[PDB]
Design a protein around this ligand. Structure first.
Ligand SMILES: *[C@@H](O)[C@H](C[C@@H]1CCNC1=O)NC(=O)[C@H](CC(C)C)NC(=O)OCC(C)(C)Sc1nc2ccccc2[nH]1
Lengths: 299, 298
């Protein structure tokens, strides 16, 4: 199993750069609007303690340089929505894909198109951790890079990059400018909480192992969701939601193994360990492949 | 993070190629579509195909090429080793600047996995020392390509043809020559014994340090030859002086001489990881080159 990203071309066609003064970051150009992190309106010194409403009221359309490559896009309107700036421009992006804005849950994976000065550099797959960070790969100038899924021809944008934390993980917002997790777009000390294991993805991984003929760990028992959740938390595993049970449905049907039976097999792995064995070649349980990732790759 | 090149320039070149009941992908550059020649085989032909004999019996109209909703008219065809070349009556306006390159084992490249001419995923792979690649390919993925991007230029280095019994993959360069001792015939084929790409493991250890993890370092050094004696014992590739030189920038950045890092890797090989992990991995990772690490860590 590879970390496998979505093809990035539909998103590459939407990347621009946005500059205010000497502060340059990336923006997303969809129809006649450009979306970008609002901290572009900050001097580096403003970032220590910004008042965004006051900083913005002093700005006009003509203070915003938006460029697709070297080509200027004239800004004709601006507004702030939570931590994102929306810049209306006088040109509709001819490469706009079918798209939507979605807010994802922890455990969901998405592709990130890392960009610098509006120019794509790389694409990779990330999982939103339960502590609402991602283990990204971002350097200076990467803010406004976006994360996305593609379902058919529709691009679902779920992430816009804002921050690198002390442990080296990353934080950002949805495309409505609402941060994932407790973070704020201020240059003040912040830290990720203690992370936990994404149970629904581990279960997806066990289903993947069964699909591939690796099933020593299937035990004879079952459990209730509540009992499993109370046990899992003792191992620093996330509790399951009803939505988690539901998105495991197709893998449960494919294998004939009820979700709660798989939960009992995982409970025994937690309480007794691997005892020297492996699953899909690994003594470690993988938690960054969703049920959909498992189907995408076994498909 | 294992990082692939943005795939858009390549997505604009993928098409679907059908011959008979066989469908796979092609690469449409200027007025030529490149795809695996085994598209021309039946089930019975694949057992032992005399490709020159099978191809001469085909006409342009036996090839259905579809770019999205448009059929491209094939107006000629030739064969170059294991790749079929279909000339079409239309230039692909999305053709990027490009070159065809043959890569060396240990080098990395991005794969755009495609089915029925449609892109499905993008990931990073390395050419293994035994000339396989550990990809993720299913039925219908043949003709998917591997590439690198420098400036605006796409360097194509791989076209996908087959999966081996062990689950690894084999294919050709864009001149149709296989990597490795494989043949585009429907027979079980084993690869040679694989080895671990040592210069890449060392690049990855430097990456682990750059990101603050140094539990595996030690106070010792080693000579190049004594390291290579141990490496070969553990089925690691030998490290060459050019490898040492390529690791220069990472050595400078961390203040850790290459032969010092070799001494740390020697200890890991002889002692294992003792339950610990490096950059989240329980195994030593060998599919990042020095260049890959440098680009992403600077
Ligand atoms: C994009 O503008 C940029 C992307 C960063 C740059 C390096 N890698 C990235 O992902 N973001 C910022 O510079 C961002 C801007 C603020 C207005 C949100 N600042 C940021 O990430 O600051 C980090 C904090 C100060 C919020 S917390 C922190 N991070 C570290 C890292 C190392 C030591 C200590 C530390 N404390």
């Amino acid at each position: 199993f590879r970390k496998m990203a979505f093809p990035s071309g539909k998103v590459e066609g939407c990347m621009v750069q946005v500059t205010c003064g000497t502060t340059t970051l990336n923006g997303l150009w969809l129809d006649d609007v450009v979306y970008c992190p609002r901290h572009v309106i900050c001097t580096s010194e403003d970032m220590l303690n910004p008042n965004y409403e006051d900083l913005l009221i002093r700005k006009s359309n003509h203070n915003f340089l938006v460029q697709a490559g070297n080509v200027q896009l004239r800004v004709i309107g601006h507004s702030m929505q939570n931590c994102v700036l929306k810049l209306k421009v006088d040109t509709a992006n001819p490469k706009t894909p079918k798209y939507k804005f979605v807010r994802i849950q922890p455990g969901q994976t998405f592709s990130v198109l890392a960009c610098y000065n509006g120019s794509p550099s790389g694409v990779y797959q990330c999982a939103m951790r339960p502590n609402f960070t991602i283990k990204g790969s971002f350097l200076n100038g990467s803010c406004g890079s976006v994360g996305f899924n593609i379902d058919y021809d529709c691009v679902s944008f779920c992430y816009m990059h804002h921050m690198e934390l002390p442990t080296g993980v990353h934080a950002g917002t949805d495309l409505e400018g609402n941060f994932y997790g407790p973070f704020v777009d201020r240059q003040t000390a912040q830290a990720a909480g203690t992370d936990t294991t994404i149970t629904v993805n581990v279960l997806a991984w066990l289903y993947a192992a069964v699909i591939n003929g690796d099933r020593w760990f299937l035990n004879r028992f079952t459990t209730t969701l509540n009992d499993f959740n109370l046990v899992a938390m003792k191992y620093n595993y996330e509790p399951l939601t009803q939505d988690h049970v539901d998105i495991l449905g197709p893998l449960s049907a494919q294998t004939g193994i009820a979700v709660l039976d798989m939960c009992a097999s995982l409970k025994e792995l937690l309480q007794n360990g691997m005892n020297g064995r492996t699953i899909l070649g690994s003594a470690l349980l993988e938690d960054e492949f969703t049920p959909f990732d498992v189907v995408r790759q076994c498909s």
